[PDB]
């Protein structure tokens, strides 16, 4: 009724306000910036997965890395010696995400079973066992990310995100503003805000404290699969099944730069930044990964070392590597 | 060289052997999807077997089947359907018996059969509620959903046309074989076993070069 007219008026107000701030685009501003053509190479192959690899996450020490694959396997590796450290047997092989806690004590996993399993690594007994099972989520998990050793946020195709309390096991904040399926998720360094890109073609910056959505961006034509924070905390880039990546600034609330090429018509599955927020690394599903200069919006490198879709990728906190896990069942560390 | 990293590579090789041993018994159970509109008795067929994704495993003639039911997920299908790339077969359920539209099931089959993740995965079609369909078609013409043709109003005729249409939904005919069926049907899991054995033989011939 009148609200529909009111809703349209509010949307028009938002659009006009957004258009007002557009002082300039990254093209003109960054024209006076030197492009990075980096070409990493396989320094280690991490074999031992017998099925598709969807998830990886880098440990905080830039030394260990965890990989979740359809083999019902969550392998904790050693990036240098390649000697596998742990092999956690997941009780639900349909995993779509994993996360390595900042303190290294815990590791996250989750997937079509829409149960966020928090596994405990450092225990008196040698084995690695599951600590908590975060349930009550009517979609499928897509990305878990630890805030501390007791708080984790999980996004699902349940049109909802959630901040939990691993101690009590009960969802303590529900983030429900979207209208499609939330496919990605990433935490700001402050661990006070986080972004989630959904199948609505929209991304959203939320507020873990207040318990309420803060900003919604719409710059894409189809499902979003990846989103990751620019390490300064107030920007984030994202990738969509429409073969395009876009950069957003949370304070500017607008779209800033686009990353696409005419030849590529494939999809995107993971996006991560460099340590300095200069290299935008994105895992396309044309059987290889891509590397851009986010600021200059120019193609700068290809990680073509797989025979299947490059699903997940991550960059160490030390910044001295990048690990890509594709559907070829092989992790690959590049430097 | 190595001081106690020599004892770390030992642990690595031990758990690598454990992974290889698990994969031997992981690639031993034949994986098998299950889909449907929701009114179709996929619940019925899983009940007759000798939240989130539902797992069901069973045995028949020393072949371990593992069925995956996902209809409990009311999410975007184009995001969790690619995880089931390696499934040997897809059991599809369609209810022959027009409560709302049936056309939805036909649209679903086209979205599964012609889906790019299933070009070589056979689909075991399952027309359910055969008894109700036979007792129903007399009371209501088949034209209400099939204006084009209703033909003879006996079950052995109308169901023949529905089956013919569903086969005709095959966007590709070279690879996929739609092992259709009807189902109190006690010989059902045997039919799934025959279809899966045929698919396994076809795959063995394919990677052996004879196809």
């Amino acid at each position, epitope marked *: 009724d009148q609200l529909r007219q009111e809703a349209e008026q509010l949307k028009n107000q938002i659009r006009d306000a957004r258009k007002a701030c557009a002082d300039a685009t990254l093209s003109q501003i960054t024209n006076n910036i030197d492009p990075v053509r980096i070409q990493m190479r396989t320094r280690r192959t991490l074999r031992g997965h017998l099925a598709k690899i969807y998830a990886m996450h880098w440990g905080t020490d830039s030394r260990l890395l965890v990989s979740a694959s359809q083999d019902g396997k969550l392998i904790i590796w050693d990036s240098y*010696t390649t000697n596998k450290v742990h092999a956690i047997p997941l009780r639900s092989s349909w995993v779509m995400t994993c996360a390595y806690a900042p303190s290294g004590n815990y590791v996250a996993c989750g997937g079509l079973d829409n149960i966020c399993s928090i596994y405990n690594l450092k225990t008196r007994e040698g084995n690695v066992r599951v600590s908590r099972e975060l349930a009550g989520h009517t979609g499928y998990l897509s990305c878990c990310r630890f805030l501390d050793d007791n708080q984790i946020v999980t996004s699902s195709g349940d049109t909802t995100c959630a901040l939990w309390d691993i101690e009590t096991g009960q969802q303590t904040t529900t983030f429900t503003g979207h209208t499609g399926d939330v496919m990605s998720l990433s935490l700001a360094p402050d661990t006070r805000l986080f972004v989630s890109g959904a199948c609505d073609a929209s991304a959203k910056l939320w507020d873990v404290r207040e318990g309420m959505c803060r900003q919604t961006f719409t710059g894409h034509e189809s499902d979003i699969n990846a989103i990751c924070f620019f390490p300064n905390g107030n920007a984030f880039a994202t990738g969509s099944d429409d073969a395009t990546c876009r950069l957003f600034d949370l304070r500017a609330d607008q779209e800033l730069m686009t990353y696409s090429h005419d030849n590529i018509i494939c999809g995107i599955t993971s996006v991560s930044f460099s340590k300095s927020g200069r290299l935008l690394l994105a895992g396309y599903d044309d059987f290889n990964c891509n590397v851009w200069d986010a600021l200059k919006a120019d193609r700068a490198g290809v990680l073509a070392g797989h025979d299947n879709r490059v699903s997940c990728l991550g960059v160490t906190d030390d910044g001295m590597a990048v690990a890509t896990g594709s559907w070829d069942s092989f992790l690959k560390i590049w430097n | 060289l190595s001081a106690e*990293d020599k004892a770390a590579v030992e642990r690595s090789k031990m758990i690598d052997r454990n992974l290889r041993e698990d994969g031997e018994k992981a690639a031993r159970e034949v994986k098998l999807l299950l889909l449907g509109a929701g009114e179709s008795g996929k619940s019925t067929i899983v009940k007759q077997m000798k939240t989130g994704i539902v797992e069901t495993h069973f045995t028949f003639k020393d072949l371990h089947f593992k069925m995956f039911d996902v209809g409990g997920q009311r999410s975007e299908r184009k995001k969790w359907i690619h995880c089931f790339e390696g499934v040997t077969a897809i059991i599809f359920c369609v209810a022959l018996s027009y409560d709302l539209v049936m056309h939805e099931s036909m649209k679903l089959f086209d979205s599964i059969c012609n889906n790019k993740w299933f070009t070589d995965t056979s689909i075991i079609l399952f027309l359910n509620k055969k008894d109700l369909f036979e007792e129903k078609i007399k009371k209501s013409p088949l034209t209400i959903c099939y204006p084009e043709y209703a033909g003879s109003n006996t079950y052995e005729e109308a169901a023949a046309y529905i089956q013919c249409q569903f086969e005709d939904l095959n966007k590709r005919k070279d690879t996929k074989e739609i092992y259709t069926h009807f189902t109190t049907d006690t010989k059902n899991v045997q039919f799934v076993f025959d279809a899966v054995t045929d698919v396994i033989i076809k795959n063995n011939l394919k990677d052996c070069g004879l196809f």
Partner: single-chain antibody, 214 residues
Framework: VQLVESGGPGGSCSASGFAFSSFGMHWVRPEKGLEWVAYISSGSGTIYYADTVKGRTISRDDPKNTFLMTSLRSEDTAMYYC??????????????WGQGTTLADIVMTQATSSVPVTPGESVSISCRSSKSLLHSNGNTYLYWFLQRPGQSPQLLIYRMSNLASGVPDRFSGSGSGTAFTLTISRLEAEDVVYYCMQHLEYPLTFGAGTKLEL
């Protein structure tokens, strides 16, 4: 986390509470000192015996989660100790020392025994080794064990810098090259001899030990 074992002239570890099948196992040897006995790893792949008693036997069973010599040599009259050590990155080998029972290569010299120490004061214990204890990977190998009187040894500082679970944060160890040290800041009554350990080579020599009188 619970190792109890049993045993005893002329002729000749019921582990519980942890995943034995993925842990290495040693043995360690009179009211004088301690020295290495044998070794085994997960899966019974690599077995090192002590040079002094080479070829005279260690053997484990994982389903049973547990066995151990042939000649009653004079030096064999001692108190043998049972330890576990899982070897992966960032682990704490020799973490748990069992109670134990009764019955060339790098060597460490201390010669600093009998240092009298009072509560509340800070104390330091030295440790000199023959060669350098630093593999090329960056790890310095020294496992500062404390032997409280009438009790099994305990790990304080594994790999010469890291601190093991349960140890209060007052303990700390350092020292590079060959000469090492262990430091206690606020000594307490339950902190009353200290034993070094090398791990670069197969023979796990210890060193004499420095008793702290209180």
């Amino acid at each position: 986390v619970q190792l109890v074992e049993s045993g005893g002239p002329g002729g000749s570890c019921s582990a519980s509470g942890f995943a034995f099948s993925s842990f290495g196992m040693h043995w360690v040897r009179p009211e004088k000192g301690l020295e290495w006995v044998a070794y085994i790893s997960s899966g019974s792949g690599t077995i090192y015996y002590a040079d002094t008693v080479k070829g005279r036997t260690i053997s484990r069973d994982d389903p049973k989660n547990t066995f151990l010599m042939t000649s009653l040599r004079s030096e064999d009259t001692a108190m043998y100790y049972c330890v576990r050590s899982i070897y992966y990155y960032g682990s704490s080998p020799f973490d748990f020392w069992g109670q134990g029972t009764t019955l060339a290569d790098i060597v460490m010299t201390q010669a600093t025994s009998s240092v009298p120490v009072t509560p509340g004061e800070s104390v330091s214990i030295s440790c000199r080794s023959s060669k350098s204890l630093l593999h090329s990977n960056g790890n310095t190998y020294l496992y500062w064990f404390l032997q409280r009187p009438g009790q099994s040894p305990q790990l304080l500082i594994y790999r010469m810098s890291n601190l093991a679970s349960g140890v209060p944060d007052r303990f700390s160890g350092s020292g590079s090259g060959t000469a090492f040290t262990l430091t206690i800041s606020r000594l307490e009554a339950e902190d009353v001899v200290y034993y070094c350990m090398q791990h670069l080579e197969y023979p796990l020599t210890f060193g004499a030990g420095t008793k702290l009188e209180l």
